[PDB]
Amino acid sequence: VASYDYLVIGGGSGGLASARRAAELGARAAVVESHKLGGTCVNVGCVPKKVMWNTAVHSEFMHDHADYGFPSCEGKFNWRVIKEKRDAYVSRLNAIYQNNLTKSHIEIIRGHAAFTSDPKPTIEVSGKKYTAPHILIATGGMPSTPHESQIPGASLGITSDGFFQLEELPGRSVIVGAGYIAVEMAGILSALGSKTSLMIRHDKVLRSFDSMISTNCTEELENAGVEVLKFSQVKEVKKTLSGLEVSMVTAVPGRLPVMTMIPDVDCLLWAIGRVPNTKDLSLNKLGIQTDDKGHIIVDEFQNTNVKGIYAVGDVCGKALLTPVAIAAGRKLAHRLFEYKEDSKLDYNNIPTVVFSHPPIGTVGLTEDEAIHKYGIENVKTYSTSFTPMYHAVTKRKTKCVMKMVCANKEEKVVGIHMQGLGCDEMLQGFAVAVKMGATKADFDNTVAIHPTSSEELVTLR
Amino acid sequence: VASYDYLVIGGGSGGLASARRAAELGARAAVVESHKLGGTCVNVGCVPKKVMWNTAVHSEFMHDHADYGFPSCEGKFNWRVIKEKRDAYVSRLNAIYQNNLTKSHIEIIRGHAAFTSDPKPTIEVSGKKYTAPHILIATGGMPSTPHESQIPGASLGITSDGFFQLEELPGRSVIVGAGYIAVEMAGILSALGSKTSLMIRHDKVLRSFDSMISTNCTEELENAGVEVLKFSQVKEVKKTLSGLEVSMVTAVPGRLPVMTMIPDVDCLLWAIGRVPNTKDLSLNKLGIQTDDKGHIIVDEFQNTNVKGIYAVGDVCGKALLTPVAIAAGRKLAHRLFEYKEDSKLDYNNIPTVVFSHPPIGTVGLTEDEAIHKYGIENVKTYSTSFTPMYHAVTKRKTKCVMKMVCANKEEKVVGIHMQGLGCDEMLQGFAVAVKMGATKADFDNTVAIHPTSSEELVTLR
Ligand SMILES: Cc1cc2nc3c(=O)[nH]c(=O)nc-3n(C[C@H](O)[C@H](O)[C@H](O)COP(=O)(O)OP(=O)(O)OC[C@H]3O[C@@H](n4cnc5c(N)ncnc54)[C@H](O)[C@@H]3O)c2cc1C
Ligand SMILES: Cc1cc2nc3c(=O)[nH]c(=O)nc-3n(C[C@H](O)[C@H](O)[C@H](O)COP(=O)(O)OP(=O)(O)OC[C@H]3O[C@@H](n4cnc5c(N)ncnc54)[C@H](O)[C@@H]3O)c2cc1C
Ligand SMILES: *S/C=C/C[S@](=O)CC=C
Ligand SMILES: *S/C=C/C[S@](=O)CC=C
Ligand SMILES: [Cl-]
Ligand SMILES: [Cl-]
Determine the 3-state secondary structure of B374 from DSSP. helix
Exposed, middle or buried, B75 (CB in 10 Å: 0-12/13-18/19+)?
exposed
Closest Cα in chain B, distance from residue A71 (Å): 6
Beta bridge partners of A401: A385, A419
Tell me which chain B residues have a C-beta less than 8 angstroms from the C-beta of A419: none
Shared-domain flag, residues B266 and B364:
no
Residues of chain A in contact with residue B77, where contact means CB-CB under 8 angstroms, are 69-70
- Examine the domain organization and report whether A119 and A154 are in the same domain: no
Residue B448: alpha-carbon gap to chain centroid = 31
Is A51 in Cβ contact with B392 (below 8 Å)?
yes
Which residues of B are catalytically annotated? Answer: 450
> Quick one: which of A162, A203, A167 has its CA closest to A185?
A162
User: Given its phi and psi angles, is residue B203 left (phi above 0), alpha (psi -120 to 50 degrees) or beta?
Assistant: alpha
* Contact (CB<8Å) B432/A322: no
Same structural domain for residues B262 and B384? no
Indicate the helix (H) or strand (E) that contains B268: strand B267-270
Burial class from Cβ neighbours inside 10 Å (0-12, 13-18, 19+) for residue B311 reads buried
Tell whether B315 and B358 lie within a shared domain: no
d(CA A31, CA A18): 10
Q: Is B111 helix (H, G, I), strand (E, B) or coil?
A: coil
Q: Are B312 and B325 in contact (CB under 8 A)?
A: yes
Pocket of ligand 1 (CB under 6 A): A 9-15, 32-35, 39-41, 44-46, 49, 112-113, 138-140, 160, 181, 277, 280-281, 313-315, 320-323, 325; B 450-451
Question: Residues near A85 by Cβ (< 8 Å), separated by ≥ 6?
Answer: A51, B67, B392, B393
What is the bridge-based pairing of β-strands A172-176 and A309-311?
Answer: unpaired
Q: Please answer whether residues B328 and B21 qualify as being in contact, where contact means their C-beta atoms are separated by less than 8 angstroms.
A: no
CATH number at residue B449: 3.30.390.30
Contacts of B158 (CB under 8 A, 6+ apart): B166, B267, B268, B269, B270
How far is residue B243's CA from residue B120's CA, in Å, rounded to a whole number?
A: 53
Burial of A425 (0-12, 13-18, 19+ CB in 10 A): buried
Return the number of other C-beta atoms located less than 10 Å from residue A375's C-beta: 11
CA distance A403 to chain B (A): 14
Co-location of A47 and A83 in the same domain: yes
What residues does B229 pair with on adjacent strands?
B199
Helix (H) or strand (E) holding A325: helix A322-337
The range of the structural domain enclosing residue B405 comes to 349-461
CA within 13 Å, CB half, A382: 19
B380 neighbors B374 (Cβ within 8 angstroms): no
In terms of domains, do A237 and A279 share one?
Answer: no
> For residue B339, what are the CA distances in angstroms to A49, A94, B343?
55, 65, 9
Give the domain-ending residue among B326, B348, B370: B348
State the smallest CA–CA distance between residue A135 and chain B in angstroms: 25
Cα B434 to Cα A362, A393, B454, distances in angstroms: 21, 35, 15
| Residues A290 and A377 reside in one and the same domain | no
Tell me the resolution in Å.
Answer: 2.1
Q: How many domains does chain B have?
A: 3
Dihedral (Cα; B432, B438, B442, B443), 10-degree rounding: 60
Please check whether residue A310 is in contact with residue A392, taking contact to mean a CB–CB distance below 8 angstroms. no
Number of residues assigned to chain B: 461
Query: Is B181 assigned to a binding site?
Result: yes
- Residue that terminates a domain, selected from B272, B295, B317: B272
Between the CA of B10 and the centroid of ligand 6 the distance, in Å, is: 11
Question: Quick check: B352 contacting A, CB < 8 Å?
Answer: yes
**CB distance B244 to B76 below 8 Å:** no
Same domain? For B20 and B124 the reply is yes
Q: Considering only CB atoms, which chain B residues are within 8 Å of A447?
A: 321, 323-324, 327, 349-351, 431
Asked if A451 reaches chain B (Cβ–Cβ under 8 Å), the answer is yes
Distances (CA, A) of B162 to A95, B94, B191, B276: 54, 19, 19, 18
Q: Which string of DSSP letters, residue by residue, matches A279-300?
A: TTS-GGGTT--B-TT-PBP--T
Paired strand residues for A109: A32
Residues 116-135 on B with a CB inside 8 Å of A are none
β-strand pairing of A195-199 with A172-176: parallel
The secondary structure of residue B439, as a DSSP letter, is B
Contact with chain A for residue B400, Cβ under 8 A: no
Cα–Cα distance for residue pair A147/B123, rounded to 1 Å: 83
Rounded Cα gap, residues B300 and A198, in angstroms: 58
Q: Which among A224, A253, A272 is the end of a domain?
A: A272
Backbone angles phi, psi at A355, to 5 degrees: -90, 65
- State whether B435 and A446 contact (CB < 8 Å): yes
Cβ of residue A61 closer than 8 Å to a chain B Cβ: yes
Same structural domain, B309 and B444? no
Is B78 touching A (CB cutoff 8 A)? yes
Q: Are residues B412 and B436 in the same domain?
A: yes
CA gap A278, A275 in Å, rounded: 9
B114 contacts chain A (CB < 8 A): no
Same domain, yes or no: B138 and B280: yes
Give the residue numbers of the binding site of A for glutathione: 13, 20, 97, 330
Residues of A83-101 as b/e, b for ≥16 C-beta within 10 angstroms? bebbeebbeebeeebbeeb
Taking CA–CA distances from A324, the nearest residue in chain B reads: B447
CA A325 to chain centroid: 12
Technique used? X-ray
Distance between CA atoms of residues A214 and A401, nearest Å? 12
CA dist., res. B411 & res. B439, Å (int): 5
Nearest CA to ligand 3 atom 5: A17
Q: What is the CATH number of the domain that holds B180?
A: 3.50.50.60
Instruction: Tell me, yes or no, if B249 comes closer than 8 A to chain A by beta carbon.
Output: no
CA distance A138 to A141: 9
Interface test mutation site (partner B, options A24, A64, A70, A80, max chain B beta carbons within 10 A): A70
Beta-carbon contacts of B88 under 8 Å, excluding residues fewer than 6 positions away, are none
Of all residues in chain B, the one with the smallest CA distance to A353 is B449
Inspect the interface and report whether the beta carbons of A445 and B346 lie closer than 8 Å: yes
Residue of B59, B180, B400, B428 to mutate when probing chain A, most A C-beta within 10 A: B428
DSSP H or E segment with residue A429: helix A423-435
- Closest residue by Cα to atom 8, ligand 4, is B17
Which ligand sits nearest to residue B324's alpha carbon?
2
Pocket of ligand 3 (CB under 6 A): A 13, 16-17, 20, 38, 41-42, 322, 326
Residues 6+ away with beta carbon under 8 Å from B208: B179
Across the interface, whether the CB atoms of B435 and A429 are under 8 A apart is answered: no
Same domain membership, residue A199 and residue A134? no
End-to-end CA separation in angstroms for chain A: 67
Which of B61, B64, B446 lies nearest to residue A432, judging by beta carbons?
Answer: B446
